[PDB]
Design a protein around this ligand. Structure first.
Ligand SMILES: O=C1CC(c2ccccc2)=NN1c1ccccc1
Ligand SMILES: [Cl-]
Ligand SMILES: [Cl-]
Ligand SMILES: [Cl-]
Ligand SMILES: [Mg+2]
Length: 342
């Protein structure tokens, strides 16, 4: 049953991996270190990630379990999937290290970023993967061009699910430019509609070649957003939980929604229409992924018999309080029960 493992030291780290993985070469590294390799069982080039200190605290142990549960569930053409997971440990008593294996992704959408046909195909694939993700009541939370892998045939996969520090979100940073305003400013309990705001920001940028809302800080970014989509009406104001955030919003002079045909000059009128339905300030009123797939902009690609949904996903663990070793034991069980894809 158990494969043979071999050891080697690569850039100050000991890696112990099954013989099937060959020609390990470092390609990146606080969450872990990553090597590219060739998988002789499948023939794919793969990425192998060795987790750093996976069980050093309750918070870290629960994050390790969360990542493994999510990656084991995702089985969709437009979403990253898990090729393998392994540990050199022979028992729970000696279990300390976790390794995760995926397909090696080449370029992300940044490098690419285009005909209108290209934009149709790229955004279609993002929405097809999001319909699947949202059907399992999962929220990605961090959709942006660097988290979308694209190959030579324009085929796309969503990766790097949100599993973010205050400093990471400060200033003139791409880590904030794609976030929905209700989550950027903690206006209210958010839901899956935050991901659709992100898709609108991405689509606009593929059409113009420019970041839609490149704010120099949170407040500058909010001002850019409200200039395009208008200031809130009383209906949305009621839904903002913070009295102080409500107070700040009402300090701003009122502004009407702009004409999107005069912003996105020359774009396909169907693309302009779809952007007006994604970039809505009130998250209750945004288009959903399932609704967007049926929009006329995607008529060339839409096939309602080839847009699958996910098996149900139990996240009850997220409200559970456990000790370090109880999270560690749950993780061990998930490593040893992994069944590889066909
Ligand atoms: O978290 C990361 C980062 C990563 C990667 C970084 C640099 C170059 C190429 C790949 N691969 N991964 C990953 C690898 C295996 C399983 C899950 C995620
Ligand atoms: Cl092997
Ligand atoms: Cl181990
Ligand atoms: Cl990015
Ligand atoms: Mg990323």
């Amino acid at each position: 049953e158990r494969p043979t493992f071999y050891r080697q030291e690569l850039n100050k780290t000991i890696w112990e991996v099954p013989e099937r993985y060959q020609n390990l070469s470092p390609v990146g590294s606080a969450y872990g270190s990553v090597c590219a390799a060739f998988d002789t069982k499948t023939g794919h080039r793969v990425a192998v990630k060795k987790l750093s200190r996976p069980f050093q605290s309750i918070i870290h142990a629960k994050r390790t379990y969360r990542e493994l549960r999510l990656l084991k569930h995702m089985k969709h053409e437009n979403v990253i999937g898990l090729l393998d997971v392994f540990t050199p440990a022979r028992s729970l008593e000696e279990f300390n290290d976790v390794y995760l294996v995926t397909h090696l992704m080449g370029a992300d959408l940044n490098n690419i970023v285009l005909t209108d046909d290209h934009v149709q195909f790229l955004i279609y694939q993002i929405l097809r993967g999001l319909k699947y993700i949202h059907s399992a009541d999962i929220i990605h939370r961090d959709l942006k061009p660097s988290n979308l892998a694209v190959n030579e045939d324009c085929e796309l996969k969503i990766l790097d699910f949100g599993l973010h520090t205050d400093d990471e979100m400060t200033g003139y940073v791409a880590t904030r430019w794609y976030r929905a305003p209700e989550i950027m400013l903690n206006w209210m309990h958010y839901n899956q509609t935050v991901d659709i705001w992100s898709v609108g920001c991405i689509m606009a940028e593929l059409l113009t070649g420019r970041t839609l809302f490149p704010g120099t800080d949170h407040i500058d970014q909010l001002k850019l957003i409200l200039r395009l989509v208008g200031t809130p009406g009383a209906e949305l104001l009621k839904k903002i939980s913070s009295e102080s955030a409500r107070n700040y919003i009402q300090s701003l002079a009122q502004m009407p929604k702009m004409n999107f045909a005069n912003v996105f000059i020359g774009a396909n009128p169907l693309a302009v229409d779809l952007l007006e339905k994604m970039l809505v300030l009130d998250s209750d009123k945004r288009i959903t992924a399932a609704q967007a797939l049926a929009h006329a902009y995607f008529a060339q690609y839409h096939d309602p018999d080839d847009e699958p949904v996910a098996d149900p996903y139990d996240q009850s663990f997220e409200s559970r309080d456990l000790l370090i070793d109880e999270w560690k034991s749950l993780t061990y069980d998930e490593v040893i029960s992994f069944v590889p894809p066909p």
